[PDB]
């Protein structure tokens, strides 16, 4: 009837992963009764405008050749640097490759992807160029944008030596900086569930067409093996690429965060489910659902045309991974950013492993399978109230814990002991106008 | 601890979609906190015995040719009209194509489908003929039955311009009429969950067999590409076609509704789940699971024969759509119907959309994300008690709302404030014998 | 607010399937309101060291020929019988083929399977031999182990004539016996959820390569149909074969049962879910997930190499069945067993059927759809507390029912009427050291 | 507002609640000549509206009055250029945007 | 003899179309007794 | 379409007939000089024309609505409703007795016939005009042919609607007015004050 200390600590680390008080890691309060080790990966990166040596082509130029550097087409990218630019960070629930960074000359109308599988996607310090017409970039084309993946190698090493895993919490901080009198720009951030699944797209096979003119051999094996089959299974994310533009995200989701660029961002990626079961590590190719063009069976057609029905385009990322199911996908856009910017991107990812016997994780176990249903119920209740992001410096929220978690923990069921903790009012997270209010009406003066 | 007004209104519109008091539409009480527009489609159709101009052949006659009218085989169908007929309406959870109508010369032993994909399925005013031996019908065969789809075009138009959707409620009314001294017949109706899923059937590929007799060319590409692969993915419904005969439905389900034909029917299609999340519109080919013939690996067989295991027959409907998941599938049979009948088929479908920015739906938004767990719990509790159908004129139930919803809303958990609302007794829906009783024992005199 | 008698009876039969008091079978307390018949299959088998006439080869020797007996390679198996042996029983959630038995010359490092599909798997009285190098066995190879399936034919007969089924409870008793002064050995048992699903593995197709040298025919149909496709769908179990060794199982799971061999075992297979819905009978080929070798897209690779990504090995069992979803998979190992042993393997499987009209089950119906949410909540709560197995003779637990079910039934929610039933303490199931304690501290003196 | 035609898209979005209010129409007619033609872009959510301006203009139409005196109405001075802005009831309007 | 809620809402939305308070739309208060859709 | 659109539309069995009192749509009824003119009905336009960005030459063929000439000349009563009634699926051997009553006021010209029939009594009544304007939106569009002489009219409906106009009230409360249900098809008809209407014809 009362939330334990372990449940409260887990709630604090789940809602505020990067909070200063969050030092000791605690596991999921479900009483799993298994030997587990909690790993906490804190990483820091310095993103800025890449030089020429960090850029590579994704087109057929580097088809079977290794990653091929830009053949001094960097003049166009310098011309980009003459004007203001746009930054985009996309946090998919992938365990490694925590975020994907994108540089644009100007704000796009959608988060588009390439139809053809890119060649050699580049980890963060190296970027890869994509053309302006939504295609892979070879030397001599028109660069459209730059893309990179922020990779955690220790996560891969530990995932290899584990029987099961589950993501406990993830937070991404976006400390922004720019030269004096050059700090213009806006920042937007939004979380939403993109529940991917293991799907195979519909492809066509190759039918042989043999015309044997031999007098003795007149078999004419004209067999029609040009049927419709399923490609290899991939983990496909149903992310609304066409609806990921900043303005659409702000107008759709109420809890979306908008502010000045100098405020940065701090996204505590949340979970969309009440249960967080262990899953066996199983990396798989990652792909993204697109849209369909041919209606097919959406209209009355012949039995021959039902094959080419509403087939949705699947964009291959050429990246293999295992994702954390039911965790939200986050998108943050920095628009009108001065090209000589700097972004201290911090990431904190805490996840629980079941160590494989004889593995390096087995030496760091921590056995206390606590059980707290009240904490899980409070986390489920709070999912729709917490905003999607906060300014970079807005850690250590006073309203969290003794005030918000208490004002929520007595709502579920009839499990209420205290008479009334504190009334809960609708907060107003107006960071742009400097009129921010908490869940209890207390104002917030800016600390940056 | 008390059900709000919005939750009560949603419960009323969900359990009694076609009730006279249901005028203002209300959204799902989950606090989604998104911009939504609720659309209500009310449609009316006049089904009767079709003339010759409304009948088309489904066989290879209209293979690539357009829909081909019956070549005056309508004499056999007139011979059908000499005797009594049978009507069947099947309400699958498909959003458009709300129901499928079938005319039979006599009551069948099962709801059979065609193995081969029919050519040009016809929307309601036009019917399509199927042979008596369970095959597609070409001119000169023996007609077995007629089939049509009742289509809602506005639903398609609105589904095109939406980011997400969810079905709020659906009701189908079946007002029956016939000439005087010609009103014989019985009506049966039953709801049951047919939880379809995106599956691909197992098919065989085409292996080339080349015998090149050339002296220089003796490759002999005899490659065995006759393996087993997966066809294109389709949304398959596991509806018990062999068990959809009227008598089996009455003997299986207790809440099934039976009455005289003149009473019509009124089916408030219900949901089998407690959660109703938003889903992105994604039309797909619709198919129905059949039965298997070859046992395959169900018995000890060689590793070569494991390929042709228990492969279930999948009947393609040649209709593409997106279905409402977890909603029940309804079947109603009118047996012993006079051929000169008339059926006023009314349908009311209310569903919530997330409007795409700049779409026509964005001008009809309605923003009040109410939250009511008590209403959802009451809906979950009431699923197993409400009968599957009512007579056509049996709207505006007195026992609903202040009596039934109140007698249920204090059951869940310990969320009870009032001492005792009203005791709940098992009702007796004996419409055939005119001895109907409500959930509280109050009799019902017939209002038609 | 109080658990009914039917719910208590179902809880008793679910937690203690083989208890002496469990005589009358009771259905799942969910108020399904359908006509159902509960079937209880009790089977007894006498497993021991097989003679030569009961052994068959799984290799290509019996490829299309019928089951082929060992060509007097039984001398090596007698040499096995010279030393101590190892027994393994694996209870997958398959309805028929309740358990799979394995004889080893010595304890293996993992529960390995054969990559190639075995030929003619043999039901219990007959065994099938597998080579020591993890391959199928032909005459003249080195035998590695013996394998058999324990089959229930009545379950198959009844599953054929049913519209739907659900597994109510399953228990396996392992009464062990051996000659005097020959009773050495240890027994280990563990349950864990292996949530299988219908998946298709990734295979390669056959591309024709034709070189027509004819002067008139120079088509050169060199079409590249060597793409990657999906095999036939199979029900794949994600059982940790590499982690199923006894020591790893004991060190991983706390509730795992270990004892002397003479104590036998008694495994009440439990369920991992709170809901137990009816499912239509649908036998399918059973396979087991393995591990992957080629990393593929787990590293940055070309768009051509993304096809051969992390493809997991799938071992085909050449056995077709329908499994009970969400039920645990059990593994029991008898190590250091004297070769002249005897195992009375008892099995009790109770499951509910919906009878098909006119079937033999329709004459044994039993209609009282009781509803008890408290019993289901108690079963959900007790899942993590009950140990995975007990000694063979440890039936009729005193702490069960009036003590444990009562001490649990008032925990959920606020549905508590009695003040305090009995405090619950952590039990100590130390069967090896003869210091066993119940959930209330009461000691247990050995009854065997 | 629209009157949807049969079988049109608008028919799926219907408000079946026709209300009648003569007082509101008369109040709008009266206020037509008092309201300013425009305001600064950020001057939404006027405090003086709704229960002060609408109320204080609501008893004047005819004598359809139940509340004797709501608030005397004074001539506002919308001098946005010199920052000396006074609302309909003399309350100064400090620049909030 | 007193203004109704619908009349007040219409007055607000007619005099202050872009006011943040105006969230829901209301029709013209004349009791037209027709099926209407407000866009 | 009419049944779905208008709430006060009247529906019944064909044998009930109809009785439609055509109502004005304005509170004032000024005199007008007689001026017969050719009548026509607006259709729908086909060519969009300048509804899209077009050249100067195509402005002429802009949205032009078809005008259907009736080849009939008359002078109309402005601000009076147009009535329309449908008898669907009636027997071809039917017989409809149409009875129209049209009462209208004239200003006679000198030396004309009308001058011999004169009413020199001009009265003034603002309350009656306001009451009619208020009742315009409440009255049903039609009634069964035999449903004349409504009991609820005159001193119940007119009275109970007479205090609402402004506050020009001397009698405090006459009768509360409830929403009637004119369900002529199902015989569950209730008047403006809840009193049931049993079929008298």
mmCIF file of C-alpha atoms in Angstrom, chain B residues 85-187:
data_model
loop_
_atom_site.group_PDB
_atom_site.id
_atom_site.type_symbol
_atom_site.label_atom_id
_atom_site.label_comp_id
_atom_site.label_asym_id
_atom_site.label_seq_id
_atom_site.Cartn_x
_atom_site.Cartn_y
_atom_site.Cartn_z
ATOM 1 C CA UNK B 85 -34.623 -17.774 -50.379
ATOM 2 C CA UNK B 86 -31.967 -17.187 -47.731
ATOM 3 C CA UNK B 87 -30.183 -13.939 -46.873
ATOM 4 C CA UNK B 88 -26.821 -13.675 -45.147
ATOM 5 C CA UNK B 89 -25.065 -10.522 -43.978
ATOM 6 C CA UNK B 90 -21.483 -10.765 -42.723
ATOM 7 C CA UNK B 91 -20.045 -7.736 -40.916
ATOM 8 C CA UNK B 92 -16.285 -8.093 -40.885
ATOM 9 C CA UNK B 93 -14.290 -5.421 -39.024
ATOM 10 C CA UNK B 94 -13.331 -3.843 -42.352
ATOM 11 C CA UNK B 95 -13.766 -0.075 -42.210
ATOM 12 C CA UNK B 96 -15.126 0.376 -45.702
ATOM 13 C CA UNK B 97 -17.073 -2.559 -47.143
ATOM 14 C CA UNK B 98 -19.021 -2.560 -43.899
ATOM 15 C CA UNK B 99 -21.033 -5.712 -44.665
ATOM 16 C CA UNK B 100 -21.133 -8.466 -47.268
ATOM 17 C CA UNK B 101 -24.524 -9.660 -48.504
ATOM 18 C CA UNK B 102 -25.299 -13.124 -49.862
ATOM 19 C CA UNK B 103 -28.414 -14.539 -51.517
ATOM 20 C CA UNK B 104 -28.924 -18.312 -51.426
ATOM 21 C CA UNK B 105 -31.676 -20.483 -52.940
ATOM 22 C CA UNK B 106 -31.761 -22.355 -49.634
ATOM 23 C CA UNK B 107 -29.905 -22.350 -46.341
ATOM 24 C CA UNK B 108 -26.339 -23.632 -46.852
ATOM 25 C CA UNK B 109 -24.439 -26.002 -44.609
ATOM 26 C CA UNK B 110 -21.544 -23.541 -44.258
ATOM 27 C CA UNK B 111 -20.348 -20.092 -45.294
ATOM 28 C CA UNK B 112 -18.122 -21.334 -48.101
ATOM 29 C CA UNK B 113 -15.801 -19.224 -50.241
ATOM 30 C CA UNK B 114 -14.198 -19.673 -53.649
ATOM 31 C CA UNK B 115 -10.703 -21.123 -53.911
ATOM 32 C CA UNK B 116 -9.801 -19.004 -56.954
ATOM 33 C CA UNK B 117 -9.747 -15.237 -56.547
ATOM 34 C CA UNK B 118 -13.014 -13.830 -57.942
ATOM 35 C CA UNK B 119 -12.903 -11.303 -60.763
ATOM 36 C CA UNK B 120 -14.330 -7.825 -60.113
ATOM 37 C CA UNK B 121 -16.233 -8.123 -56.817
ATOM 38 C CA UNK B 122 -19.274 -5.888 -57.078
ATOM 39 C CA UNK B 123 -20.398 -3.175 -54.685
ATOM 40 C CA UNK B 124 -23.894 -3.451 -53.226
ATOM 41 C CA UNK B 125 -26.208 -2.300 -56.066
ATOM 42 C CA UNK B 126 -24.461 -4.807 -58.343
ATOM 43 C CA UNK B 127 -24.146 -8.448 -57.317
ATOM 44 C CA UNK B 128 -21.786 -11.183 -58.463
ATOM 45 C CA UNK B 129 -22.771 -14.801 -59.054
ATOM 46 C CA UNK B 130 -20.949 -17.868 -57.740
ATOM 47 C CA UNK B 131 -21.530 -21.430 -58.891
ATOM 48 C CA UNK B 132 -23.276 -24.158 -56.910
ATOM 49 C CA UNK B 133 -20.122 -26.305 -56.714
ATOM 50 C CA UNK B 134 -18.191 -23.662 -54.759
ATOM 51 C CA UNK B 135 -16.415 -22.155 -57.774
ATOM 52 C CA UNK B 136 -16.449 -18.937 -59.752
ATOM 53 C CA UNK B 137 -19.357 -18.579 -62.164
ATOM 54 C CA UNK B 138 -19.101 -18.223 -65.929
ATOM 55 C CA UNK B 139 -22.102 -17.995 -68.227
ATOM 56 C CA UNK B 140 -23.623 -21.422 -68.761
ATOM 57 C CA UNK B 141 -22.774 -22.835 -65.323
ATOM 58 C CA UNK B 142 -25.136 -23.516 -62.432
ATOM 59 C CA UNK B 143 -25.542 -20.432 -60.207
ATOM 60 C CA UNK B 144 -25.045 -21.194 -56.542
ATOM 61 C CA UNK B 145 -25.428 -17.864 -54.781
ATOM 62 C CA UNK B 146 -25.142 -14.102 -55.157
ATOM 63 C CA UNK B 147 -22.690 -11.883 -53.287
ATOM 64 C CA UNK B 148 -22.207 -8.136 -52.880
ATOM 65 C CA UNK B 149 -20.221 -5.683 -50.761
ATOM 66 C CA UNK B 150 -21.811 -2.661 -49.097
ATOM 67 C CA UNK B 151 -19.308 0.153 -49.587
ATOM 68 C CA UNK B 152 -18.838 3.491 -47.829
ATOM 69 C CA UNK B 153 -16.943 5.929 -50.095
ATOM 70 C CA UNK B 154 -16.733 8.797 -47.617
ATOM 71 C CA UNK B 155 -14.916 6.464 -45.223
ATOM 72 C CA UNK B 156 -12.283 5.856 -47.902
ATOM 73 C CA UNK B 157 -11.964 9.567 -48.682
ATOM 74 C CA UNK B 158 -11.480 10.441 -45.015
ATOM 75 C CA UNK B 159 -9.122 7.527 -44.324
ATOM 76 C CA UNK B 160 -6.880 8.755 -47.135
ATOM 77 C CA UNK B 161 -6.435 12.133 -45.396
ATOM 78 C CA UNK B 162 -5.618 10.949 -41.862
ATOM 79 C CA UNK B 163 -2.495 10.175 -39.844
ATOM 80 C CA UNK B 164 -4.254 7.699 -37.550
ATOM 81 C CA UNK B 165 -7.654 6.183 -36.911
ATOM 82 C CA UNK B 166 -9.577 4.070 -34.439
ATOM 83 C CA UNK B 167 -13.099 2.684 -34.629
ATOM 84 C CA UNK B 168 -15.324 4.039 -31.872
ATOM 85 C CA UNK B 169 -18.575 2.167 -32.522
ATOM 86 C CA UNK B 170 -20.507 0.364 -35.236
ATOM 87 C CA UNK B 171 -24.137 -0.681 -35.467
ATOM 88 C CA UNK B 172 -26.152 -2.380 -38.189
ATOM 89 C CA UNK B 173 -29.959 -2.309 -38.350
ATOM 90 C CA UNK B 174 -31.861 -4.716 -40.575
ATOM 91 C CA UNK B 175 -35.453 -3.481 -40.918
ATOM 92 C CA UNK B 176 -37.302 -6.278 -42.718
ATOM 93 C CA UNK B 177 -40.466 -5.979 -44.792
ATOM 94 C CA UNK B 178 -42.531 -8.240 -47.027
ATOM 95 C CA UNK B 179 -45.970 -8.267 -48.673
ATOM 96 C CA UNK B 180 -48.961 -9.256 -46.573
ATOM 97 C CA UNK B 181 -49.503 -12.991 -45.965
ATOM 98 C CA UNK B 182 -45.891 -13.478 -47.138
ATOM 99 C CA UNK B 183 -43.955 -12.700 -43.947
ATOM 100 C CA UNK B 184 -42.617 -16.146 -43.044
ATOM 101 C CA UNK B 185 -39.013 -16.654 -42.004
ATOM 102 C CA UNK B 186 -36.560 -16.621 -39.103
ATOM 103 C CA UNK B 187 -33.651 -14.318 -38.263
#
